[PDB]
Design a protein around this ligand. Structure first.
Ligand SMILES: *[C@@H]1O[C@H](CO)[C@@H](O[C@@H]2O[C@H](CO)[C@@H](O[C@@H]3O[C@H](CO)[C@@H](O)[C@H](O)[C@@H]3O)[C@H](O)[C@H]2NC(C)=O)[C@H](O)[C@H]1NC(C)=O
Ligand SMILES: [Ca+2]
Length: 476
């Protein structure tokens, strides 16, 4: 599927080993500290697609599928998929080729997309960089395919970042020489055939900043689908230019100020407001980036604060910001693990309840985004616009005049007082009735254009014109 097809999508990102077992157990042990395979599979995912689609997601991003190093190392097993060794075989832990094809098929029957995580930068090896036996890699079975062994020392030095190796002498990540034609041609053949064989709709590309820019356009073309790259840097001046070589990137620039604004009742709304505008104007296309506040490479949101209202606000923001929302499996069950491996909790241990507070919040927010898109062909390309901020509040507006969604977020938290916010800048017409679609109440725009928004319990508010909801299931 094309970048244009992807704008409307909403992604649930999961770790295949950690999301759902074939046997559907909600009690099977998964001790994150042990860093071992816990038994999640592609068949497991198929059987829980209703859980995901019930939150209003239209796509999933699963971790890499290639055969990995087989050892249990001092850092555990390759359960996460990022330590590949044989790119033409699949990771048997997750199932067979037929199972991966069954997963893509199942998503397609539901009108959903499959996005697969891929690594081009490196293989993985159990042991010291100096001791690597290159014959174990397929098809890159020779030192000649790789950059000389050195570990990255200075992440400020982009040459080193691209040319030296990730990992360490316990698990080393041999760095492919992506400047060689034989390497490029092999990867380009591979990714086109991977996409074809498994009917993959999009790719998430790992470790993009660690491969020279002039590798990516050919890879994105060979894939033939939308690619979103992991460029792990919060500076928009460093990260957004990667959109010149790849369709999208993960929105790490928004990540940092977004997390800071809501992780406590004293977070900075100014920083978030300003970053929204910075990304809007400076990135080739904000509407092709992926918004997130939780993933497998940072502490989860709830690891900073257990306040359920704060978690509701940040989830609402992710869904209603420019670009493609991305929620990480567990966020909807208010998982609170810190840094890797603590943030790779098994989703099944939650019991998958569909009545958790965040499941319902996420469902409500995806519901209105999906509906708005179905009625407003301009919504996905309309640039999200911050219209208001104060010490504890940010409001923003996205959508064509007459159909815009206006979102008011608060960092007051669960102890927030009940008051009326006099909201200016929403751009509705005097006297227009709006529905607050999270709590299903109504508000009417004043004759001066102002919207009186009832605030309470630190809760997010999401407004949309009532007449436009006619015939929908939203607040019915
Ligand atoms: C998707 O399925 C296709 C079709 O089976 C796979 O095609 C196979 O690709 C391999 C690997 O490139 C080809 O391997 C051989 O490599 C040697 C080079 O030493 C070459 O000289 C041989 O002629 C041959 O190409 C193989 O021919 C090809 N098999 C077929 C039946 O076309 C493809 O690899 C799969 N893609 C993925 C990512 O699984
Ligand atoms: Ca590299």
């Amino acid at each position: 599927a094309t970048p244009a097809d992807w704008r409307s999508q909403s992604i649930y990102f999961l770790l295949t080993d950690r999301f759902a077992r074939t046997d559907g157990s909600t009690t099977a042990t998964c001790n994150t500290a042990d860093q071992k395979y816990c038994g999640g599979t592609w068949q497991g995912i198929i059987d829980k697609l209703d859980y995901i689609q019930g939150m209003g997601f239209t796509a999933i991003w699963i971790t890499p599928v290639t055969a990995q190093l087989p050892q249990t190392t001092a850092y555990g097993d390759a359960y996460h998929g990022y330590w590949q060794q044989d790119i033409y075989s699949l990771n048997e832990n997750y199932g067979t080729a037929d199972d991966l094809k069954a997963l893509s098929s199942a998503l397609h029957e539901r009108g959903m997309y499959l996005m697969v995580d891929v690594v081009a930068n490196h293989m993985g090896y159990d042991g010291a960089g100096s001791s690597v036996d290159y014959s174990v890699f397929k098809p890159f079975s020779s030192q000649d395919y790789f950059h000389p062994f050195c570990f990255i020392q200075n992440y400020e030095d982009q040459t080193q970042v691209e040319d030296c190796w990730l990992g360490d002498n316990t698990v080393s990540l041999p760095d492919l020489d992506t400047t060689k034609d034989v390497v490029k041609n092999e990867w380009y053949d591979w990714v086109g055939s991977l996409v074809s064989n498994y009917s993959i709709d999009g790719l998430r590309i790992d470790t993009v900043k660690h491969v020279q820019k002039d590798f990516w356009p050919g890879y994105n073309k060979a894939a033939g689908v939308y690619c979103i790259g992991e460029v792990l840097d919060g500076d928009p001046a460093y990260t957004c230019p990667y959109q010149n070589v790849m369709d999208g990137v993960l929105n790490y620039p928004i990540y940092y100020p977004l997390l800071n604004a809501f992780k406590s009742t004293s977070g900075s709304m100014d920083d978030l407001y300003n970053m929204i505008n910075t990304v809007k104007s400076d990135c080739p296309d904000s509407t092709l980036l992926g918004t997130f506040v939780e993933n497998h490479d940072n502490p989860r949101f709830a690891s900073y604060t257990n306040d359920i209202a704060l978690a509701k606000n940040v989830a609402a923001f992710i869904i209603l910001n420019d670009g493609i929302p991305i929620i990480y499996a567990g966020q909807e069950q208010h998982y609170a693990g810190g840094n890797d491996p603590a943030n790779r909790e098994a989703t099944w241990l939650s019991g998958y309840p569909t009545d958790s507070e965040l499941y319902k919040l996420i469902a409500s927010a995806n519901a209105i985004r999906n509906y708005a898109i179905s009625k407003d062909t301009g919504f996905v390309t309309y640039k999200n616009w911050p219209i208001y901020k104060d010490d504890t509040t940010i409001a923003m507006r996205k959508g064509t005049d007459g159909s815009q969604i206006v979102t008011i977020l608060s960092n007051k938290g669960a102890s927030g007082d009940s008051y009326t916010l006099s909201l200016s800048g929403a751009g509705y017409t005097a006297g227009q009735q709006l529905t607050e679609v999270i709590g299903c109440t109504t508000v009417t725009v004043g004759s001066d254009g102002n919207v009186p928004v009832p605030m309470a319990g630190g809760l997010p508010r999401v407004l949309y014109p009532t007449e436009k909801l006619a015939g929908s299931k939203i607040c019915s």
